[PDB]
């Protein structure tokens, strides 16, 4: 026993505990990247509005301010 | 007899739990009859009701035994309407009762008479309904028992026991139980 | 012997945890390659963006 | 640098002004004195006073209203709100409710979601109302669903179902830890996280009666089979074996165990008392 | 016998392995809270300048008109 | 005996095979969101500086035809 | 009632407001209006959770953005009225999206088009329980983005696509869209770690077609480059293979419990594995 | 359903008709008409699968809107017409992007003229296979980058520009690049545990040079940074070095085959150890 | 062409011509043209590698946009300045970029402010190693990120600020900072895992002051927080206070050499451990 | 000579790399002069010199010995100044050197003869300058040996070899030399 029973315990018993914290670790870290993968699908769109909105608006303001 | 939509609660005190019976509210129902209670369409059950002064009306209480048997959670709606036995073709003469200790506190070898058992039996639980497959608690010299239907004999399915029944005891499967009466076989 | 029975069980138990750290691994990696692309599209729209609206001001200021 | 002294007094110049601006009261005047009331609110800012700073933000919005402006006020508002955090919690209340119900009128339903979890955060963190912080969790939950915003409507849901559990109100937090933990099974990424919620489910029912726990758990193994695989169904069959003979000392001797391999946290050591006093007895 | 010591250093290298994602570990989960934060930073300006584009058009619409 | 002899020399490579893959894999993330973390920096500028263009811009056309 | 009462009150009021002004003008300020008050009645409505209505006004306004000169407008109140319909009724939503996806085709914009029949795809899955129409919506979806040279989701969307396929018995289809994705992925030394799983998929169709079909692949696929000969999978794939080949079904059974036990089943695999277990 | 008949027929009509117009113009309306014409059509092109065509659309439309004092859209039709020619005929594509590039670094914007190089230099090296211009293109952007303090690009891009130096047989090069990126990661809170990795290649590539001057590199090295001297490549170094150093091949493929069985060595290990080996 | 001599002669003659065009406008409406110009040839300088010239006409560009009525414009001109002149001459960057902090502090934003004022730290820390000016700068930038209630940047400014203090002898500051963020990471569910290190480090410092104020320290912060009993950290705490205890500096060397073997530590926790190391050698 | 940037070279061939003098160019210098190598401000070698065809001028080759001891890298740069004797205090009388196996591959127990091969150190590099520290290569029958300069007896860092060194020799570090003769301790 002696040596190699205690190390065999210790070891083994630490080594358990750092995995399930590992665990722990990563399943937070995902659902925190999933929110944020929300966050920018919403950020696309609001930009594509504006582009969409400045782009018409100064074309059909340059024209009629011409054409006057 | 036409169904209501009623509520399992929690049986009040001891003795009426002993005393095998769903226990309603004094302003519905007394004590002998019989009704059906359905939780769904596939299994449903008959049980005998009896009145108590804490009851509160809408409601229905079982035992633990009775939940255990007929899968009921406590606040779970249920349906239960009056049921009439029949007393000239269903009426039970003779029954086999598996039985065995209930408490794993204290068994024991002392022999058990089968036959003065049987009589209590009568004495408790004349005139009350019993279907294969129900379990129960027996108490005999302040010693509880459980109890399982194995067989019933005018077969039924479901009948009204007479006073003058007679029950036999087998002792269940890995247990040290020595019987020795006339309620064997 | 027994006790070693007991340690195989440990490593079968740290076998299982590591497979499933592995996998978890994996799909997050996906995930922010996906996202990725999405940070590189939004950045390419802004930088138009900002042009388009300072040649308007110019302009119309020129009008002015 | 300049310390708070030379700060204020540029501040209270600046007010002094707007409000004889004010006073000859038009268009150029009334904006003109917001103007001034928007950099009177800055300088107070830097000078680190947090309740004249508040008050300038409130008359600037309180104009800004007047006027026939209200993207404006609602932006006064909210800044108000901030401004106040720290110097008073019910003037910041009343200032981002206000806000909230202007943004609603025009549809910007996220952004009222948003103010209701700041305002929930006040009531739970420095008010002791517990009531009004699941109102307003429940209102922001349902806004963000109107959405189809589902990974963002699900936090709410479980601060809710937390807290009602907390109350004694059991149905409540049963319902929704089953809804998110059906909801998150089938999602390939959610899965590894959906064996809490159902564990968490089970312990609610075991609060009620034995007989509940042991049919619920069972239930769930059928809907769900990995967890018939895990610690904690071990854990509960254990305990549900153990207390149906009023054996209290292998109740604490699994619950120690337990505890050993991982720490629990406030929320499952109140539970777990709760359960055996009530029903190991 | 003398295999058996295998064991034993090859369980020391796991344990330094294990340390080392640990650590790394930690550090991902900072960086996404900063990242997260800065994201919630930029909806609100999205929104603002959304907002004030559109009102602003509508506003010289109608008064040309 | 050289049953489980075998076993453990066959359960620790094993081991040894995932935590190194699980090591490379972690690299390779933390590389990642260092660049996007940059990367949104940029845009935050960009945005910044465009919205208060935006609001010079708007509020010098109101005006300069409020005095027309 | 409270909210719902009064929001409902003035919802109907604004309507009757917006016919009376339109059956008024029957002049460009006035629809205009009528406009306006439509989507502010949408809104409300959206409030005490009455979808059918909001679905109607925002259609309604809809259409009147359409009669005036304007597309941009019509494509967002289409799209917003498929999305509150996607309660109530499927097919309004299958139609109203439709209507968004080719104004906004129109114009030359092909990253929403991508979105948009993706979520048509999702509810025909979902709630119609119908796959053909799925499989379609999909492979356009995939076709749009991968035009754009964003390759990430055009292989997400052919992967639905090739289990979907192989599922109802079409089994080339899958396979060559397996083959593609795997070789795909693995130059990227990113996504080197996942390619062995595609593979393994792609084994499996071979294998549900002949024995021999999947002996080659297996060797063609451990050719093109070694790491998929990690004894993980190729082990169980060639002990399959020999459990087939001798007819000994009982070996196959311990086999495929043997590797269930260290690491669960999903649905498909297991589908698929009784399958080959049968035809035996 | 898609088909391309009438997609074709359409986007043929379309160019006629702006041909047409264009022509007639022998004030400036007809230019700003033609142009919106032929993008139309070009998107059309697109959705019809032909490439070329709707390379040549863009390119015209480019052309054309050039001729205006306006710029700031000539450079985002090349862009275009480069994506749509990135399919058929590579050359092409790099005289667009080139024009492009040109544009933008000439408006001021730098950030977004190193992204267009990168892109370049990927055609050359995909389709092209010519390493000098791809070499060329690589260090033009990294330098483009490193002007806006865009360190981790920059760093890329370098690393890309050491790894085929090297594979060129210009080991000073690599070595200066892999020195120079091994001490900057050195001094960060994250990309310090991959810091170990680029000193290892450095030490490879000394090697070829001679032994002598890899030996007294690792010993450099290994007291600049303590944590190097405990990790598997500096003790594969060692071995290595012990094995060369007396002439014995056997010891010096065992190691290797030692090293290769926990983890598998790229293309570019594996051939820097054979060119190593082979000189004895 | 890639040549540097044609790019820089045209950059030249280029803005030789500017300022011919502006001396003549001085004898509005040129000054904006002066100002294209003048742009025109500090990005052209810029692509020329000559920074001290780029620095030098973006400038004088933001010199001619402040006199007409315009400040944002002034201020990216000076912020463009700065990252130009950063390579060559810092005082001149360290300039511009106060000029534009000023500017966007006044004009309203914040962030941006806080941002500048980091630049400035770094740049102070990595060229002039003035420590005190670093540290003013740091807790400049955490004071407006706390007011703007972003926390995360807040901390992060607050944790270098701290270390430098620790550094500089200036033990009292460190200690309150360390645990206040230790607490705020005690009330987390992600970084509760790693509030331990802040804790940690806190005790060291109490330890440099003396060693019955770090055994209360430790007990406080196990009463606190119990998961810190039982990490690594705690025991090794415990085993060197013992051994300062009973004078056998052999024992606090052998204990801190153990623990060094199974993993490498930092420059600052060695410098610490030898600072304490050599008061106790003393008492011995 | 004034100490010129000079790189160091591979040398040419074996046979002048066993010589033991560094090979030059033959534009540059002359046999038999002596340059004290200086690389670093605290490290100057004293090295002489020795022509063969080839080898571009501008340039030092030095054998694997030599770049192991002063520790140089092909490409580095160097400076090369010229060194003068003092015949009065540097001469060398005698000298002590280190010695054991180079190759273990060609370890023996036969029998040295430790003044025979004395007499041939002689022999080869008579008149060639040394220095206290040097290591180097020695060439018995059939034998490649290491020898390392632990000191030198007239006590000098440097000096100029002659005929009259009786170098006794000594195994040491656990060297299986079997060492006969005269010439030890």
């Given at each position: 026993?002696?040596?190699?029973?205690?190390?065999?315990?210790?070891?083994?018993?630490?080594?358990?505990?750092?995995?399930?914290?590992?665990?722990?670790?990563?399943?937070?870290?995902?659902?925190?990247?999933?929110?944020?993968?929300?966050?920018?699908?919403?950020?696309?769109?609001?930009?594509?509005?504006?582009?969409?909105?400045?782009?018409?608006?100064?074309?059909?303001?340059?024209?009629?301010?011409?054409?006057? | 007899?036409?169904?209501?939509?009623?509520?399992?609660?929690?049986?009040?005190?001891?003795?009426?739990?002993?005393?095998?019976?769903?226990?309603?509210?004094?302003?519905?129902?007394?004590?002998?009859?019989?009704?059906?209670?359905?939780?769904?369409?596939?299994?449903?059950?008959?049980?005998?009701?009896?009145?108590?002064?804490?009851?509160?009306?809408?409601?229905?209480?079982?035992?633990?035994?009775?939940?255990?048997?007929?899968?009921?959670?406590?606040?779970?709606?249920?349906?239960?309407?009056?049921?009439?036995?029949?007393?000239?073709?269903?009426?039970?003469?003779?029954?086999?009762?598996?039985?065995?200790?209930?408490?794993?506190?204290?068994?024991?070898?002392?022999?058990?008479?089968?036959?003065?058992?049987?009589?209590?039996?009568?004495?408790?639980?004349?005139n009350q309904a019993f279907s294969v497959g129900q379990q129960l608690v027996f108490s005999f010299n302040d010693k509880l028992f459980g109890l399982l239907v194995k067989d019933i004999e005018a077969k039924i399915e479901v009948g009204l026991v007479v006073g003058n029944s007679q029950v036999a005891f087998e002792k269940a499967e890995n247990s040290s139980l020595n019987l020795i009466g006339k309620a064997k076989? | 012997?027994?006790?070693?029975?007991?340690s195989l069980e440990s490593t079968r138990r740290m076998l299982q945890l590591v497979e499933e750290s592995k996998d978890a691994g994996i799909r997050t990696l996906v995930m922010l390659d996906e996202q990725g692309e999405q940070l590189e599209r939004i950045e390419e729209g802004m930088d138009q963006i900002n042009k388009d609206m300072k040649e308007a001001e110019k302009n119309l200021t020129d009008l002015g | 640098?300049?310390?708070?002294?030379?700060?204020?007094?540029?501040?209270?110049?600046?007010?002094?002004?707007?409000?004889?601006?004010?006073?000859?009261?038009?268009?150029?005047?009334?904006?003109?004195?917001?103007?001034?009331?928007?950099?009177?609110?800055?300088?107070?800012?830097?000078?680190?006073?947090?309740?004249?700073?508040?008050?300038?933000?409130?008359?600037?919005?309180?104009?800004?209203?007047?006027?026939?402006?209200?993207?404006?006020?609602?932006?006064?508002?909210?800044?108000?709100?901030?401004?106040?955090?720290?110097?008073?919690?019910?003037?910041?209340?009343?200032?981002?409710?206000?806000?909230?119900?202007?943004?609603?009128?025009?549809?910007?339903?996220?952004?009222?979601?948003?103010?209701?979890?700041?305002?929930?955060?006040?009531?739970?963190?420095?008010?002791?109302?517990?009531?009004?912080?699941?109102?307003?969790?429940?209102?922001?939950?349902?806004?963000?669903?109107?959405?189809?915003?589902?990974?963002?409507?699900?936090?709410?849901?479980?601060?809710?179902?937390?807290?009602?559990?907390?109350?004694?109100?059991?149905?409540?937090?049963?319902?929704?830890?089953?809804?998110?933990?059906?909801?998150?099974?089938?999602?390939?990424?959610?899965?590894?996280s959906a064996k809490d919620y159902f564990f968490k489910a089970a312990l609610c029912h075991f609060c009620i009666d034995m007989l509940n726990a042991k049919l619920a758990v069972q239930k769930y193994e059928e809907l769900f089979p990995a967890f018939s695989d895990s610690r904690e169904c071990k854990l509960m069959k254990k305990l549900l074996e153990a207390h149906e003979e009023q054996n209290v000392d292998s109740?604490?001797?699994?619950?120690?165990?337990?505890?050993?391999?991982?720490?629990?946290?406030?929320?499952?050591?109140?539970?777990?008392?709760?359960?055996?006093?009530?029903?190991?007895?």
């Open positions: 026993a002696l040596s190699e029973i205690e190390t065999r315990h210790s070891e083994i018993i630490k080594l358990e505990n750092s995995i399930r914290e590992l665990h722990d670790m990563f399943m937070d870290m995902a659902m925190l990247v999933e929110s944020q993968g929300e966050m920018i699908d919403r950020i696309e769109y609001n930009v594509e509005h504006a582009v969409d909105y400045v782009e018409r608006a100064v074309s059909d303001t340059k024209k009629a301010v011409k054409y006057q | 007899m036409a169904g209501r939509s009623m509520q399992a609660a929690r049986c009040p005190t001891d003795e009426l739990s002993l005393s095998n019976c769903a226990v309603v509210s004094e302003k519905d129902y007394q004590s002998g009859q019989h009704v059906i209670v359905r939780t769904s369409p596939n299994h449903k059950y008959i049980f005998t009701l009896r009145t108590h002064p804490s009851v509160v009306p809408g409601s229905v209480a079982f035992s633990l035994p009775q939940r255990k048997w007929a899968g009921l959670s406590i606040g779970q709606e249920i349906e239960v309407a009056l049921y009439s036995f029949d007393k000239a073709k269903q009426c039970i003469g003779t029954m086999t009762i598996e039985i065995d200790f209930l408490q794993k506190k204290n068994i024991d070898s002392n022999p058990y008479d089968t036959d003065k058992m049987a009589a209590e039996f009568i004495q408790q639980f004349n076989t | 012997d027994q006790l070693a029975d007991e | 640098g300049m310390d708070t002294s030379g700060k204020q007094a540029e501040a209270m110049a600046l007010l002094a002004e707007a409000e004889r601006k004010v006073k000859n009261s038009g268009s150029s005047k009334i904006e003109e004195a917001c103007e001034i009331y928007a950099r009177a609110a800055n300088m107070f800012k830097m000078a680190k006073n947090w309740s004249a700073a508040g008050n300038a933000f409130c008359q600037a919005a309180q104009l800004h209203l007047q006027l026939q402006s209200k993207h404006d006020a609602a932006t006064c508002f909210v800044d108000a709100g901030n401004a106040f955090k720290k110097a008073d919690p019910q003037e910041a209340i009343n200032c981002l409710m206000r806000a909230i119900e202007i943004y609603t009128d025009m549809g910007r339903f996220t952004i009222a979601a948003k103010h209701h979890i700041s305002i929930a955060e006040i009531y739970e963190t420095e008010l002791v109302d517990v009531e009004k912080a699941i109102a307003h969790y429940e209102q922001s939950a349902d806004y963000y669903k109107g959405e189809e915003s589902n990974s963002s409507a699900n936090k709410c849901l479980l601060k809710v179902a937390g807290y009602a559990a907390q109350l004694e109100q059991y149905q409540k937090a049963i319902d929704i830890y089953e809804q998110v933990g059906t909801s998150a099974m089938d999602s390939p990424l959610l899965k590894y109740y604490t001797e699994s619950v120690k165990e337990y505890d050993s391999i991982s720490r629990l946290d406030q929320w499952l050591t109140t539970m777990l008392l709760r359960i055996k006093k009530t029903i190991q007895g």
